[PDB]
Design a protein around this nucleic acid. Structure first.
Lengths: 95, 96, 87, 120, 94, 95, 83, 65, 96, 95, 87
DNA sequence: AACCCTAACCCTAACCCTAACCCTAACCCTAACCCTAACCCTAACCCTAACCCTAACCCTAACCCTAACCCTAACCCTAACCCTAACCCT
DNA sequence: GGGTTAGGGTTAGGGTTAGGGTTAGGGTTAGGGTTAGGGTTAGGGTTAGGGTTAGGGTTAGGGTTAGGGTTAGGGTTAGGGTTAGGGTTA
């Protein structure tokens, strides 16, 4: 049984964390699944070109942090950058 | 006789507050099948595929009609003209 | 006796009162007369393009069944990332 | 011992480099494997497109009394086409110009007749 | 100083083959060089996605032939397909 | 005495049959430098970069003016209005 | 960084011949301000994109290649300068 | 159709030249009156591309310079 | 140093936009009156009738010359030859 | 093998001295039926009608080929060109 | 069911043994590269603007079969009368 | 902003591998910077000629009326076409 | 995903006439253009000097990879918390 990859458990956990006594519907799960895979190939796709343009081939944390300000607008880009910096700091502080 | 001007807005609000399909399924399926037969014979269709096609066509038609109305209402005219659709398509870059 | 394929009256599948309520969703109050033909022609051209793209895709995959995933991929290649059906 | 093999472009009947595309497609991180006949098709397509573009540019330059292909000639030859204008529609060429397209309404259709001092 | 890759000799040979006593200018060479690299990442970029969508990873002659009808319009697509087929036939023959 | 209606077409044809620059270089360079200083100080500019910027701006302005004229001439008006530019930007999806 | 005398860099007779290339015969009055504002917004967007690109490359010189790449990412594949 | 072409030639009436210019312009009108000959109406200004001057330009079979 | 090789293209734009008669209204009546003298003598031509025969012949030569130019332009030629006039008359069904 | 220049004339004389049909009947009937279906459905065909249609088409094709050959042989060329057919159609007034 | 060959002859059949055989009757000796392709296209209009006349004639008499008596009146309008098969 | 009677789909546990997240050592491969020197960005100025700035005269152009008539606005008897379960297969 | 047999009720498709919406005609009185004139301000040479651009050994702090354990993670399964319609009340 070759099951298909889908983002359901993490989406439900995030929804329960940001809104109690809530949930997802039928088509809403597929909409969110198609939305995640769409931005997954957009942010990661620009990092490869940005690394190739500088004669490099290493996509680290800065390659993803800089790609936030290109795809995301203004306030959302700064918020995502701050969240990513806090996450990488908590990761480097303790393994 | 009372003056019209309220049934149109009521129908607009009723159709905007609802998410029901307006175009049929079997005629659209027959149309896309006839279109596909012009390129290669022995072709079939599914349900989700024609549903996505109908949704995309409805969205495109809604956007085109909204653009046509916004172009016509700016020229001191409450109605639209057949040339306004071609004008919007030329501005958007659909036919050049 | 027992055959018959397809015709062409399906092209005139768009009526006149049914398209009135369709344009009312966007914000159109009054239409015209030649709109019933211009919109039909534009829809036919766009559908021919999308059907040709889906046929090329299903020929790349060597399949004869136009699935929803191929239609979604063709719409995304044209510039319309449709959600809901597929993945 | 052994023989002296020639280049790969001479054995295919084309002038575009075949080994260059095969090496550029792999280094671009596009695919982990490149086919044998894959760069030949792309090279032939690119060569045909370049030949058509150069032929259109020469045909457009042969009427302007200038045997040198200037960017204005390329801009006039690309925009004056049906199958080539749709490919590079959103592509702008530097050091070029705009095709002369004057509307019929801007033409001087005034005519000093009729519109005179009263009616004779 | 590390030389830079540019399509100049092949472009000049093609121009001389399709039009004698002709040549390229200064900015026209850079325009053609930027035009070649633009379509180089467009046709080859779609083949990778088309191969990944079918759970494959082999970009052969059919992957490039099918990508012609997607990028090129109508008559130009058929002409490019015919040219590519004749080229692959001359390659497989000898 | 020539009646008005011919000098405009003559100037249009003369400017369309020529490929000369219309905007200056030093004012545009100072403008883009002042714009770059709003984000990060200690920034410089080149010649080909500002040339490509001027070419792109000239192409965008030509396209916008052509769209505005084509929108204004279809309403029985030979002149354009300040709202026509916003209308074209709203139709094209720039706002 | 100069005083606010460069934003008004677009005059009035010089923009008349600029619109004449496309096919405009008569303009108006508020166009000199609306076009300036639109050009300022578009230039701010392109400059922000180029700054983000040169910050990814850790460079302080806005080259023509970065501008061409930003224009292609926005949807304007400019030819001529760069590669 | 002939009335719109009269305004381009700075005229308020339809002359027999404008009739010939408007009839030989549309495809539905030229195919209907193909064998129809007009009197004082002239012909349509049509110049071939091969009849353009220079064309070859520079030199083709020169000797010295 | 100006006449040999000029005005060849500076004279087409005049007659192409003019409605006047190229053949002059004087040498034409004697050419028609002498032809009809052989079929049946004792004849006469009207004033308005001699102009219709002149306009009919002045328009037929234009089409014949256009066909001759189109036939000569195909063989990589810029001038028409006497062998090209007989060629255009053999396809339209004139002499054979 | 035969030297090229005599088999062609022999075949020409053999096909000119005979009055046999060259095009088939069923494919032509299917073609004219498909053409008639484009205007109005539920249409039939007879035998004498399609025979007269085939005869008229053969006569028109023979005349067009003869005109094309006579136009091509007058330009010092033994072969015909695809533009010669359009030239003959423009001279004859077929459009 | 129905046969998959619903192409209804996509203007084919008349190929090398037919076009060459028809050109050999007139006086054509050799054939270049192209020559064909458009040879099957120039015959499409000859049946497009002739059979339509017969259909329109049969529609006037409230009939449905294009007999030989109606195919001669359509060709007479263009200027190509045929004797024998018509009558 | 009846919220209710209807009422199935959003609903908290739970659960069995479980398949990916983490660990743990090796490496190994991926950025400054200090000499440097070369050519391109920028800094004062002269001229003088096309280019640009500022009134007068007037001939078309857009707008606000006036009457006017033909198309798109709103039921009514239908009764044909669009759904709504329920299996059944190829 | 197609293809069947009931059915039946909401949706689609035939007149109709009356009310306001483009269209057609006449100055109209405010609204851009230009050619005569002048006073520029941008289009070109000469430098030259500092302020950036542009290659090259050399690490050590930035990474990459073959091995387990294992916390976190992925298809099913109830019974309950508001969600859709139907008469009331408003």
């Amino acid at each position: 049984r070759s099951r298909k990859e889908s983002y359901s458990v993490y989406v439900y956990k995030v929804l329960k964390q940001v809104h109690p006594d809530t949930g997802i519907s039928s088509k809403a799960m597929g909409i969110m699944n198609s939305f995640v895979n769409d931005i997954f190939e957009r942010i990661a796709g620009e990092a490869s070109r940005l690394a190739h343009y500088n004669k490099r081939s290493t996509i680290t944390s800065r390659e993803i942090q800089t790609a936030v300000r290109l795809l995301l607008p203004g306030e959302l880009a700064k918020h995502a950058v701050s969240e990513g910096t806090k996450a990488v700091t908590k990761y480097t502080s303790a393994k | 006789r009372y003056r019209p001007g309220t049934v149109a807005l009521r129908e607009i609000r009723r159709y905007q507050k609802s998410t029901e399909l307006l175009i049929r399924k079997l005629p659209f399926q027959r149309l896309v099948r006839e279109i596909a037969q012009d390129f290669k014979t022995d072709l079939r269709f599914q349900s989700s595929a024609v549903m996505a096609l109908q949704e995309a066509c409805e969205a495109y038609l809604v956007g085109l009609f909204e653009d046509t109305n916004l172009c016509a209402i700016h020229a001191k005219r409450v109605t639209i003209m057949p040339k306004d659709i071609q004008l919007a398509r030329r501005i958007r870059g659909e036919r050049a | 006796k027992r055959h018959r394929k397809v015709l062409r009256d399906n092209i005139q599948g768009i009526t006149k009162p049914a398209i009135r309520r369709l344009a009312r969703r966007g914000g159109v109050k009054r239409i015209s007369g030649l709109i019933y033909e211009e919109t039909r022609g534009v829809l036919k051209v766009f559908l021919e393009n999308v059907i040709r793209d889906a046929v090329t895709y299903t020929e790349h995959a060597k399949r004869k069944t136009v699935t929803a995933m191929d239609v979604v991929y063709a719409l995304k290649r044209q510039g319309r990332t449709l959600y809901g059906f597929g993945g | 011992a052994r023989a002296k093999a020639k280049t790969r472009s001479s054995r295919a009947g084309l002038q575009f480099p075949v080994g260059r595309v095969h090496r550029l497609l792999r280094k671009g991180n596009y695919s982990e494997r490149v086919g044998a006949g894959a760069p030949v098709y792309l090279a032939a397509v690119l060569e045909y497109l370049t030949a058509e573009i150069l032929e259109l540019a020469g045909n457009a330059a042969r009427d302007n009394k200038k045997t040198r292909i200037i960017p204005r000639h390329l801009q006039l030859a690309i925009r004056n086409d049906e199958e080539l204008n749709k490919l590079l529609g959103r592509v702008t060429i530097a050091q070029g110009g705009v095709l002369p397209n004057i509307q019929a309404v801007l033409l001087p259709k005034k005519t000093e007749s009729h519109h005179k001092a009263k009616g004779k």
